[PDB]
Design a binder for this molecule. Structure first.
Ligand code: PNT
Ligand code: PNT
Ligand code: PNT
Ligand code: PNT
Ligand code: CA
Ligand code: CA
Ligand code: CA
Ligand code: CA
Ligand code: ZN
Ligand code: ZN
Lengths: 91, 91
């Protein structure tokens, strides 16, 4: 598999790693999203310690108002992170 | 870096790998997009041999009508591929 192909599978695997822990096994509830950010985005994003802060991130990500981040919503989150990283390192 | 963090950087690196070859160094023209698909998505997508087929893929990806795929448009392409892969392997 190419690097791109392995990257794609890694996105799928991290989503399932955290989504399957509680409740709906195919969505990230706020608790699962906080764990994902703190354990997997520790170089890209500030650690979340407050309920207020994960509330706000979930508000941004949650396009259908169910209080959770589904796989489509997670893909939008990945696009946001990737865009911000790409731009951080360039002029 | 986590797996997710390395995956994010891999998306950036494959985009730059192909975008920088010709013309606008920050967009994939059809020629660059064809090369990316054929060399980097050979397990996920059918090889492109015809101008018609890359025309069609570029039509799908090109949201601002400039005939090219910018980084935002490429992120949408990555979301499409990842979604299709995730769903292929599940019930
Ligand atoms: N010392 C580093 N940060 C760094 C190290 C290696 C690297 O290998 C290719 C990745 C793309 C290289 C140029 O574009 C970016 C954009 C964003 C990030 C990032 N989100 N960290 C990293 C690189 C890149 C950056
Ligand atoms: N050898 C080592 N130990 C080492 C080498 C490079 C390194 O680099 C740290 C992070 C570099 C890239 C990630 O940093 C950001 C920060 C903010 C944003 C943002 N704008 N959201 C995106 C990415 C760290 C450790
Ligand atoms: N034999 C395989 N295909 C395969 C091998 C390893 C693997 O490691 C974790 C990746 C996620 C595992 C379960 O979800 C998916 C969804 C899509 C793909 C794919 N796009 N190929 C692969 C896996 C996964 C699949
Ligand atoms: N040991 C080996 N040599 C080997 C092991 C597994 C393998 O698996 C091939 C591809 C598996 C996952 C990629 O296959 C697709 C197909 C269609 C879609 C789609 N719906 N677009 C998405 C993914 C290949 C070789
Ligand atoms: Ca869950
Ligand atoms: Ca939702
Ligand atoms: Ca180009
Ligand atoms: Ca465009
Ligand atoms: Zn760039
Ligand atoms: Zn799944």
């Amino acid at each position: 598999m190419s690097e791109l192909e392995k990257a794609v599978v890694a996105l799928i695997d991290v989503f399932h790693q955290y989504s399957g822990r509680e409740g709906d096994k195919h969505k990230l509830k706020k608790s699962e999203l906080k764990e994902l950010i703190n354990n997997e985005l520790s170089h890209f994003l500030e650690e979340i310690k407050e309920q207020e802060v994960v509330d706000k991130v979930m508000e941004t990500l949650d396009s259908d108002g169910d209080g959770e981040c589904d796989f489509q919503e997670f893909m939008a989150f990945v696009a946001m992170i990737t865009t911000a990283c790409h731009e951080f390192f360039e002029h």
